[PDB]
Amino acid sequence: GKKKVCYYYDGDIGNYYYGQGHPMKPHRIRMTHNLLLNYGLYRKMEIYRPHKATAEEMTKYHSDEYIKFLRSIRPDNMSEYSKQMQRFNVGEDCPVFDGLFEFCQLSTGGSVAGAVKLNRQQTDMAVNWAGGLHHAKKSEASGFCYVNDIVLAILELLKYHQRVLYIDIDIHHGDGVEEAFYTTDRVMTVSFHKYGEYFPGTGDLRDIGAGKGKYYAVNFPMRDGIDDESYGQIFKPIISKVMEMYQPSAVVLQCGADSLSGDRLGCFNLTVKGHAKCVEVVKTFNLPLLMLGGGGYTIRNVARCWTYETAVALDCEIPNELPYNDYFEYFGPDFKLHISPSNMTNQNTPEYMEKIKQRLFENLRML
Numbered sequence: 001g002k003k004k005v006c007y008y009y010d011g012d013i014g015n016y017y018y019g020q021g022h023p024m025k026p027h028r029i030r031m032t033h034n035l036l037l038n039y040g041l042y043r044k045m046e047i048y049r050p051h052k053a054t055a056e057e058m059t060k061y062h063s064d065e066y067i068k069f070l071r072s073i074r075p076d077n078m079s080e081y082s083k084q085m086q087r088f089n090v091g092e093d094c095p096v097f098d099g100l101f102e103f104c105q106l107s108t109g110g111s112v113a114g115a116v117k118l119n120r121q122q123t124d125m126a127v128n129w130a131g132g133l134h135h136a137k138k139s140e141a142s143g144f145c146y147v148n149d150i151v152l153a154i155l156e157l158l159k160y161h162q163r164v165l166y167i168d169i170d171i172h173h174g175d176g177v178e179e180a181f182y183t184t185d186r187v188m189t190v191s192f193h194k195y196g197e198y199f200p201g202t203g204d205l206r207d208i209g210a211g212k213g214k215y216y217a218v219n220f221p222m223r224d225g226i227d228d229e230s231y232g233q234i235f236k237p238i239i240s241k242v243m244e245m246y247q248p249s250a251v252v253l254q255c256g257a258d259s260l261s262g263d264r265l266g267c268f269n270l271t272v273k274g275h276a277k278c279v280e281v282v283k284t285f286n287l288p289l290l291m292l293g294g295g296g297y298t299i300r301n302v303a304r305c306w307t308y309e310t311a312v313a314l315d316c317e318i319p320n321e322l323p324y325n326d327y328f329e330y331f332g333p334d335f336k337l338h339i340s341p342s343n344m345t346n347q348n349t350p351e352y353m354e355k356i357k358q359r360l361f362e363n364l365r366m367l
């Protein structure tokens with residue numbers, strides 16, 4: 001049936017700024033919120049403002065030293081932390097910016113709060129578009145991510161769920177999450193990503209977990225230009241097999257929008273409908289589900305994607321004609337919700353897709 005949806009958002013999230021020319025733009029979270037408000041999707045959800053996650057909540061995963069550094073570093077005192085910046089990988093892809101720690105607190109607060117709501121059986125779905133920062137490591141920032149809100153949310157789900165399934169459709173390998181749970185069978189991580197001469201350089205289909213975690217990490221490496229057809233020939237069959245074999249009791253779905261056609265950093269060719277089909281597929285299993293954001297660097301498309309995925313979560317049909325909103329000019333020249341794929345070549349032949357799917361199916365038989 002239709003499901004209850006709780007949505008997490010802080011009105012200040014859009015004001016955090018990574019710096020001039022940096023592709024990560026928290027403003028896209030505010031564009032998403034304003035678009036979904038203007039479509040009237042607020043009348044259908046319970047809207048919550050997440051608390052600022054404490055350093056203590058963050059150290060359930062991250063090292064005390066790394067969290068202490070994040071809570072301390074500021075653009076005005078950076079000069080005194082030259083040593084720690086190198087140690088914790090802060091200052092290149094992951095710059096020091098005003099309110100960095102508060103931004104991490106809000107991103108994490110939404111994911112953890114959503115997991116608590118699911119644990120209490122008070123919602124069917126919890127949504128936190130400011131979360132999904134899957135690259136952060138135990139004691140290091142990485143790929144525009146500082147605090148791994150996903151790992152923290154999964155640890156919260158593990159208090160009441162024996163097995164948790166994590167699915168990541170961001171164009172980049174979900175390395176921080178996979179690494180956190182690499183040697184456990186209590187979390188199965190499934191990542192679909194571009195692999196080959198691309199960040200973070202991990203996620204080979206031969207990375208399948210280790211020790212008790214062997215066969216509990218699944219990686220589907222893809223080439224440039226994947227389209228809705230190709231993604232659609234493999235996503236439902238793999239997720240169906242994972243659901244059958246693993247039988248998770250909760251699911252976390254990272255909906256990174258950098259896998260869409262026309263992304264500033266991505267090289268895939270999915271439309272918003274193609275990307276949202278993943279949400280439709282996962283939602284049909286009727287399991288407690290935490291939906292998170294992630295990458296997405298052509299911000300008009302990120303807002304379209306996450307607004308449509310929120311409509312999918314609510315089983316609410318919304319028109320293609322965009323309603324007027326505070327960022328209406330960003331959606332020109334068409335002012336439509338849905339996007340068209342480009343003419344880029346799909347390097348993922350149908351035979352390649354079937355062959356990788358078959359290799360993963362062999363690994364899934366080992367559960």
Ligand SMILES: CCCC[C@H](NC(=O)[C@H](C)c1c(C)[nH]c2ccc(O)cc12)c1ncc(-c2cc3ccccc3nc2OC)[nH]1
Binds near residue numbers: 020092197198201295
């Ligand atoms: C989602 C995160 C993607 C990160 C990614 N980083 C990298 O590609 C770097 C070189 C990298 C590193 C450190 N490790 C790697 C391992 C494998 C690999 O193939 C690459 C890397 C990135 N792609 C765009 C940028 C980028 C960063 C900027 C920072 C400040 C200002 C402007 C920037 N512009 C950028 O692209 C307009 N960075």
Ligand SMILES: [Ca+2]
Binds near residue numbers: 171173174193
């Ligand atoms: Ca991924």
Ligand SMILES: [Ca+2]
Binds near residue numbers: 183185187189217
């Ligand atoms: Ca695992």
Ligand SMILES: [Zn+2]
Binds near residue numbers: 258296
């Ligand atoms: Zn990404």
